């Protein structure tokens, strides 16, 4: 739990982070989908508990630089992410 892992639940393959889920879907319900129609909440076969699936941390990276004709130092901008988590 709580890391970027490649998971395989009943032949359903995926990659992401598995977290303890506070979702409360009824006992007969098995899977959980979202707006984009993909499974984000799952129930383990061995032990009937609820897990939330979250894609691993990703983002965009851009480079700030002056002209190479005058210097070659650069800076890095990570877009839309608190860099205490990079």
């Amino acid at each position: 739990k709580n890391k970027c892992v490649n998971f395989n639940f009943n032949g359903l393959k995926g990659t992401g982070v598995l977290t303890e889920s506070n979702k409360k879907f009824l006992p007969f319900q098995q899977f959980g989908r979202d707006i984009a129609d993909t499974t984000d909440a799952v129930r383990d076969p061995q032990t009937l508990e609820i897990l939330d699936i979250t894609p691993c941390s990703f983002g965009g990276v851009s480079v700030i630089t002056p002209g190479t004709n005058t210097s070659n130092q650069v800076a890095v901008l990570y877009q839309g992410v608190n860099c205490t988590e990079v």
């Binding site: 984009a36 965009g60 877009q79 839309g80």
Partner: peptide, 24 residues
């Protein structure tokens, strides 16, 4: 006041360069 969302698919919104306070 009179004028008024979690996409993991790869769609992002970039903030504008000019903040509202500078426009004001």
């Amino acid at each position: 006041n009179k004028v008024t969302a979690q996409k993991f698919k790869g769609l992002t919104v970039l903030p504008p360069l000019l903040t509202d306070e500078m426009i004001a």
